[PDB]
Design a protein around this nucleic acid. Structure first.
Length: 280
DNA sequence: GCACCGAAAGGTGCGTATTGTCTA
């Protein structure tokens, strides 16, 4: 699954709480960023402080509009993949997901764009470079195992004239469904190299063949919450407005509390026994 | 493209778009 969200200045706490960490992007390399994401630097870049002999970015933002700190792309593995990675414990599966993300983001980077204005005349440019902070996470809001990576694309890109400007995001934002398919294709290919058999689900989605739908359902509490929020509002899961799909996804939430990580995984393992899961 | 940003006859958000496993 690939979902996206435009991150605004009011998200500067939450977007820094993303901080298991990796920089990616030709933009990042050119700034000398590679390896683990230093959080102070991440906060600086969120604020548009690219530093190293450059003016603070984005000052031409209207006060009536919100300023944009970035674009969050969230890659989420199928549940059976999450199970094998996080319950059984498999670094190869984690690695396979990391590769799928990195290769998809290369295709996101290819689509990075900017504007330039030459004497009242605006042209759109394909810059092909991004600065991206990747943060891998492991649980859902209902504390189910859930392998997922937040790829925070910072709102910046280097134009042809070598100048740092805000990202025009259209080409990435309108290709979410395509990049989603790249992630699946890459993950599936990587999982097949590791010897796994796959089961296909109408969309390009798949799961590991040795884990069945009932076993998936046992570990998908957030899905049960969404499915119920439609059944109560009388709404049908086939056709619903973007205002409604966002409603069910945000309203149906309950609240949670600082989970004992070592104790959580033991719960997962026991649940997986109850469900009868053979991690082979 | 527009209309308001800082003050460059330049640059920005705006809206875009989002399948399931349900993020941000």
């Amino acid at each position: 699954m690939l979902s996206h969200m435009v991150l605004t200045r009011q998200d500067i706490g939450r977007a820094a709480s993303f901080y298991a960490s990796e920089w990616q992007g030709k933009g990042a390399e050119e700034l000398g960023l590679s390896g683990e994401v230093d959080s102070k630097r991440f906060r600086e870049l969120l604020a548009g402080n690219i530093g190293e002999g450059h003016r603070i970015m984005r000052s031409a933002t209207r006060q009536d509009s919100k300023e944009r700190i970035g674009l969050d792309l969230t890659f989420s593995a199928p549940k059976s993949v999450s199970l094998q990675a996080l319950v059984a414990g498999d670094a190869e599966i984690i690695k396979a997901h990391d590769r799928a993300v990195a290769r998809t983001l290369e295709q996101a980077e290819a689509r990075a764009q900017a504007r330039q204005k030459i004497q009242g005349k605006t042209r759109i440019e394909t810059t092909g470079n991004l600065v991206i902070g990747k943060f891998r996470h492991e649980t859902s809001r209902e504390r189910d195992p859930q392998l997922h990576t937040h790829a925070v694309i910072l709102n910046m890109t280097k134009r042809s004239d070598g100048q740092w400007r805000a990202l025009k995001n259209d080409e990435i934002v309108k290709a979410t469904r395509y990049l989603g398919a790249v992630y699946n294709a890459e993950l599936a290919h990587e999982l097949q190299k590791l010897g796994y058999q796959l089961r296909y689900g109408k969309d390009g989605n798949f799961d590991l063949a040795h884990i069945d739908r009932q076993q998936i359902e046992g570990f998908s509490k957030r899905t049960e919450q969404i499915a119920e929020w439609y059944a109560a509002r009388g709404l049908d899961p086939n056709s619903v407005s973007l205002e409604q799909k966002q409603a069910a996804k945000v309203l149906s939430r309950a609240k949670k509390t600082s989970v004992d990580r070592e104790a959580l995984r033991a719960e997962w393992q026991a649940t997986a026994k109850e469900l009868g899961i053979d991690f082979s």
